């Protein structure tokens, strides 16, 4: 009989971002006629008390952590993690655990106002996909063979750069 708790969503979906990236935290919840305020929390600290969304214009490493929201009808949400990194490239995914059959969208994100070319996405040290100009790598339907350590690399100007690795787990069922 108890109403659903609030839910936090990130737009875009990437849980890890680079400093200077913009992130919008959205709160899915219900409001009563006399109180439509939304409360946002960053690691247990209150950060906002009215708007349904919390917009981070230019992320900093200090923004990393757990975020939760709530309304006066939808209770405290489970936490959503945001990781903020510093580097020329970042391999992004909407999550790090996928079920077999699931599509996997990876993005080799370059730092604000830089452009990457000759990009390769690698899995367990082996090339999985190459693009002459930076593009995303979509794995149609995940199999157990997709579990592993992923990273991407390419060129920004004449500088060879490589992202940190991201470990992806595929669960059965
Ligand atoms: Hg904060
Ligand atoms: Hg996607």
Curated annotation (Swiss-Prot):
Outcome, altering residue 86 to V: In allele FCGR3B*01
Annotated compartments: Cell membrane; Secreted
Primary location: membrane
Membrane topology designation: Lipid-anchor; GPI-anchor
Disulfide pattern: 27-69, 108-152
Glycan attachment sites: 36, 43, 62, 72, 160, 167
Keywords from the UniProt entry: Cell membrane, Disulfide bond, Glycoprotein, GPI-anchor, IgG-binding protein, Immunoglobulin domain, Lipoprotein, Membrane, Receptor, Repeat, Secreted, Signal
Free-text function comment from the UniProt entry: Receptor for the Fc region of immunoglobulins gamma. Low affinity receptor. Binds complexed or aggregated IgG and also monomeric IgG. Contrary to III-A, is not capable to mediate antibody-dependent cytotoxicity and phagocytosis. May serve as a trap for immune complexes in the peripheral circulation which does not activate neutrophils.
Additional facts recorded: Encoded by one of two nearly identical genes: FCGR3A and FCGR3B (Shown here) which are expressed in a tissue-specific manner.
Protein name: Low affinity immunoglobulin gamma Fc region receptor III-B
Upper taxonomic lineage: Eukaryota, Metazoa, Chordata, Craniata, Vertebrata
Gene: FCGR3B
